[PDB]
Amino acid sequence: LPAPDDTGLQAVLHTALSQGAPGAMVRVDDNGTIHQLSEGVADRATGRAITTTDRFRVGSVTKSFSAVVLLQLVDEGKLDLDASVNTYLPGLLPDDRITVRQVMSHRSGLYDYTNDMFAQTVPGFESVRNKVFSYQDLITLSLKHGVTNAPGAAYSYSNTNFVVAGMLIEKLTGHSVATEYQNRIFTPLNLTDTFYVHPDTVIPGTHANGYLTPDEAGGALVDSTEQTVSWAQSAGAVISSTQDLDTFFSALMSGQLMSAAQLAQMQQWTTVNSTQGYGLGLRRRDLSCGISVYGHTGTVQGYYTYAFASKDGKRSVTALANTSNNVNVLNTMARTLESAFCGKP
Ligand SMILES: C[C@@H](NC(=O)[C@@H](C)NC(=O)CCCC[C@H](NC(=O)C[NH3+])C(=O)[O-])C(=O)O
């Protein structure tokens, strides 16, 4: 791989701030050599500076944790990816042919209930921030709509899929997702900055506060830091740090979290767009310099996360901007991948 470009990374962060991110930061673990940069504030009212050690809400990076647990259950013989979801969760879905593999790769056709919840950004956030939902509550919300397409038809993102994933994990193991993440991933990898505290609203330790950008251009930002994230749970409630996500994705890609066979299934790509694929709770992004990286993006109110690693896990990158509902910042932060993996032009 070419050398990571710190000057380019510095510019990306600086640009994100110019676009509305109170703070932005990135950490690269380049085969044992660390690159770390940050600019801006963790708390815009107090002015405390953001740092690469600040904890944050990783959004759907959570999906990769959920998929890891499920694939270990496959290795253990407790789950068959091609078995129907209704086999393990009787009567849950109206189609007894929607499979676990389809749900894990967003090819189930299940309607995404969050499209209803967040039609309006801030009102939607105020509506769910302090709510506690059961997994079934969420599935029911989804099922009120018809499916959007035939199972296995094509990739269509839906948080409902990983809500089902969490329900499967708890049913098959008889434990909470928190317990499973801890025993199967957090402890083994010693991810000391990683937690799943749902429905607690507090983020443990020093963290970056999240700032939700309202739908109205120029509108005042909303501190969205403390919420239950119950609308996502196994689809997006994990809290972590740049160091911990780098360790996790490097461990995943270097083959330390499941059998070679299950990692292969995890990387069977379904087309998302011309430069992206989705496997099982895992995203593939193709960079301009012809390099593909693996991991996941995350969006939780006030937090945009990119956490990706090279195919062999030797280089990993995690970037975070503490604002959300700001496409300019979202697009800009994606450039950290180009600077970190592709290097200087
Ligand atoms: C992107 C990532 N998905 C996630 O991380 C999941 C957990 N988050 C969402 O589906 C976004 C919820 C709305 C956020 C809100 N948007 C609105 O409110 C829009 N009205 C915001 O930007 O904070 C993935 O699929 O890889």
- Helix/strand/pairing category: alpha+beta
How do the strands of the widest beta sheet line up side by side? 3-2-1-13-12-11-10-9-8
Q: Which term fits the overall shape?
A: globular
Question: What is the level 1 CATH name?
Answer: Alpha Beta
- Say which molecules are bound, naming each kind only once: glycyl-L-alpha-amino-epsilon-pimelyl-D-alanyl-D-alanine
Proportion of beta-strand residues:
15-25%
Number of helices: 12
Specify the biggest β-sheet.
9 strands, antiparallel
SSE topology string: HEEEEHHHHHHHHEEEHHEEEEEEEH
- CATH topology, anyone? Beta-lactamase
Radius of gyration: 19 Å
Helix content: 25-40%
PDB class: hydrolase
Keywords: michaelis complex, hydrolase
Assembly: monomeric
Entry title: michaelis complex of streptomyces R61 DD-peptidase with a specific peptidoglycan substrate fragment
How would you describe this structure to a colleague?
Its EC number is 3.4.16.4. Pathway: Cell wall biogenesis; peptidoglycan biosynthesis. This is D-alanyl-D-alanine carboxypeptidase. It is found in: Secreted. It comes from Streptomyces sp. (strain R61). The chain has 345 residues and is an alpha+beta fold. The chain has one domain: Beta-lactamase (3-Layer(aba) Sandwich), CATH 3.40.710.10. Helices cover 34% and strands 19% of the residues. The protein contains twelve helices and 14 strands. The protein has helices spanning 6-18, 61-75, 85-88, 100-104, 114-117, 121-128, 135-143, 159-173, 177-186, 242-253, 260-266, 327-342; strands spanning 23-30, 33-43, 48-49, 56-57, 211-212, 222-223, 239-240, 270-273, 276-278, 283-286, 292-300, 303-310, 315-321, 323-324. The strands form three sheets. A nine-stranded antiparallel sheet has the order 3-2-1-13-12-11-10-9-8, sandwiched between helices. A hairpin with a 4-residue loop joins strand 2 (33-43) and strand 3 (48-49). Helix 1 packs antiparallel against helix 12 (327-342), helix 2 crosses helix 9 (177-186) and helix 7 packs across helix 8. It binds glycyl-L-alpha-amino-epsilon-pimelyl-D-alanyl-D-alanine. Glycyl-L-alpha-amino-epsilon-pimelyl-D-alanyl-D-alanine (REX) binds at residues 59-60, 114, 118, 121, 124, 157, 159, 212, 232, 235-236, 296-299, 301, 324-325.
